[PDB]
Amino acid sequence: DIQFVSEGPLRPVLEYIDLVS
Amino acid sequence: INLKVAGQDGSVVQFKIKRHTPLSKLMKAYCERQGLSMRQIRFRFDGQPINETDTPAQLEMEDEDTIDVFQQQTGG
Amino acid sequence: MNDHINLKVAGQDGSVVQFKIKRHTPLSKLMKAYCERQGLSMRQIRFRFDGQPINETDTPAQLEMEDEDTIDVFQQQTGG
Amino acid sequence: MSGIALSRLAQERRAWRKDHPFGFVAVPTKNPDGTMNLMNWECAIPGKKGTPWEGGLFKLRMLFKDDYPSSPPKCKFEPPLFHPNVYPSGTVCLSILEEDKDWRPAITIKQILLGIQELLNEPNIQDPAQAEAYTIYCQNRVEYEKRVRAQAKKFAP
Amino acid sequence: PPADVSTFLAFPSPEKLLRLGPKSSVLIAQQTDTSDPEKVVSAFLKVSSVFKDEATVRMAVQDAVDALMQKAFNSSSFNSNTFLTRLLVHMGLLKSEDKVKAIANLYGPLMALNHMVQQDYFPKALAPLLLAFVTKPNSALESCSFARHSLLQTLYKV
């Protein structure tokens, strides 16, 4: 039996950094 | 166990499957989802071509390992 | 339009870090910020966009970068 | 009506900039008047880690026809690569790059470059495209190893 | 450009080759452009196509081959690798980007090759390539057993 779990990015954005300042 | 299917479109599909159920089922499932066929695509684990009759057991697969998808080809 | 855009840095290990930056800010700011994040030093790595090295004074505008462009970062060390 | 080809190529380019395989390069060229020429891409393929090609970055040109994506592009290494399945002209001979074989409109530029990368260390010796690489491969693997390693070193970034 | 020569190259036969006279070697060589390997190959296959074991025809074909090839190899610009590559293409032993139709009868070209590689003017660097593709499995070659194995024996000599 098969069951779907999840589908996401292979290389997700790990962190966001703001250089606008 | 859980097994990840790394595609060539930047996405990964994760499936849960028994330790002794052939990956033939996982294959036609992934294809069924991305609207792909199996003649056009091939699968590999840690670099080795996967046979449809293999289960996670004999290939010593563990929880959250990755299957890699590739477009069938040959030079000439 | 926006003063700023989003740029991503991808490493060999698949890691991705995303930066919000002004179109005319020298990219040295982004590279230093990435180094701080990963705890590395500037001389340890190189940044490339469209296969070309990024200089510290290069701005996103000068390199004609666009929103969501990805920069590839490479470590320079080698074993012997 | 070839504007179908240009619409798809701009779409390929768009996706490539946001998400492309690490170490790879694929940049449209520019006409004399500074505008983009989506019909001629300058590309580079990194050798796969764990192979004699490792560390090399191999320049390749991707030429598209007006009937693209019905037809595949022509892929030529510049300079021509020492490799069994690369014609003396530099043209890569791969099934996915042949309209009558394994090519199909859905194949992305990313897949093309990934395919050629796969070919590098997995040549088809039974159907060679050049004589030099075939001969050395079959008569002297030591020499073949040397040539590949040397070639990769010559084309390191 | 003598007509009897052009007539021979258009429709080769051992008879026409002989009837050209004792200058057939020099004549054929001059009528062919020895700067374009594609044409040197075509000339080589045309000449070698009328090969026969019989001594008179044999010498006429070998003398022509020698004349044709010495004029070509002595040209410092002539690319010997393009010649050999394209020769293998026309002989159907190697794929071609432009999809060339392979000749049918390889006995003559093989016997001619056998003679050529024994000559000093032949670039020794090409021999390993000939050996590889003459050795490589091919149905047309399997039908030319005696000629094939003879060429191979010659390529292994010393």
Measure CA E9 to chain center.
Answer: 13
Number of Cβ within 10 Å of residue C22's Cβ equals: 17
**Any idea of the CA torsion for B42, B46, B48, B52, to the nearest 10 degrees?**
-50
Any CB–CB contact under 8 A between A12 and chain B? no
Any CB–CB contact under 8 A between A8 and chain C? no
Check D114 against B8: CB less than 8 A apart. yes
Any CB–CB contact under 8 A between A6 and chain B? yes
Counted domains in chain E: 1
CA distance C9 to chain A (A): 9
Cβ distance D93 to B75 under 8 Å? yes
**Angle, to 10 degrees, between the axis of helix E37-48 and the axis of helix E107-117?**
110
Q: Which residues pair with B5 in a beta bridge?
A: B13, B67
Deposited experimental method: X-ray
Measure CA D23 to chain center.
Answer: 14
**Angle, to 10 degrees, between the axis of helix D131-139 and the axis of helix E80-90?**
90
Structure-token pair, residue D131: 């004589």
Cβ contacts of A5 on chain B, cutoff 8 Å: 2, 14-16
Check A8 against B11: CB less than 8 A apart. yes
Q: Which residues pair with B68 in a beta bridge?
A: B6, B44
> Which residues does a gap of C–N over 2.5 Å follow in chain D?
none
Interatomic CA distance for residues E48 and D78, integer angstroms: 37
Report how many Cβ contacts below 8 Å link chain A to chain C: 40
Structure-token pair, residue B73: 């080809």
The side-by-side arrangement of strands in the sheet containing B11-16 is: A3-9, B11-16, B2-6, B65-71, B41-45, B48-49
Interatomic CA distance for residues D112 and D72, integer angstroms: 10
CA distance C50 to chain D (A): 6
Residue in E106, E117, E100 with CA at minimum distance from that of residue E147: E106
Residue in C16, C17, C15, C19 with CA at minimum distance from that of residue C6: C19
Counted domains in chain D: 1
E strand or H helix at D58, and its extent?
Answer: strand D57-63
Check D88 against E85: CB less than 8 A apart. yes
Check which CATH number belongs to the domain holding D101 and give it.
3.10.110.10
- Tokens 């081959």: give the residue: E65
What is the largest distance, in Å, between two alpha-carbon atoms of chain E? 44
Interatomic CA distance for residues D112 and D21, integer angstroms: 11
B33 is in which domain, residue-wise? 1-76
Structure-token pair, residue C48: 């490339």
Interatomic CA distance for residues D138 and D144, integer angstroms: 9
| E and C adjacent (3 or more CB pairs under 8 angstroms) | no
Structure-token pair, residue E28: 């054929």
Cβ contacts of B21 on chain A, cutoff 8 Å: 1
Any CB–CB contact under 8 A between E38 and chain D? no
D130 is in which domain, residue-wise? 1-157
DSSP string, E18-66: HHT-TTHHHHHHHHS-TT-HHHHHHHHHHHHTT--SSHHHHHHHHHHHH
Structure-token pair, residue A3: 């069951």
Model resolution, angstroms? 2.4
Counted domains in chain B: 1
By C-alpha distance, the chain E residue nearest D139 is E132
Check which CATH number belongs to the domain holding E80 and give it.
1.25.40.200
Check C30 against A11: CB less than 8 A apart. no
Interatomic CA distance for residues D149 and D120, integer angstroms: 12
Interatomic CA distance for residues B37 and B66, integer angstroms: 20
Structure-token pair, residue C69: 């462009």
Taking phi first (over 0 means left), then psi (-120 to 50 degrees means alpha), and beta for anything else, what does residue B33 get?
alpha
Interatomic CA distance for residues E82 and E94, integer angstroms: 13
* D61, D62, D66, D82, D83 from D41: Cα distances, Å: 6, 5, 14, 22, 22
CA distance D114 to chain C (A): 16
The backbone torsions φ and ψ at residue D145, rounded to the nearest 5 degrees and listed phi first, read: -55, -50
Cβ distance C54 to C31 under 8 Å? yes
Q: How far apart are the first and last CA of chain B?
A: 40
Structure-token pair, residue E44: 């080589």
What SS3 class is residue C48? Answer: strand
The backbone torsions φ and ψ at residue D92, rounded to the nearest 5 degrees and listed phi first, read: -80, 130
Check which CATH number belongs to the domain holding C3 and give it.
3.10.20.90
The backbone torsions φ and ψ at residue D46, rounded to the nearest 5 degrees and listed phi first, read: -80, 145
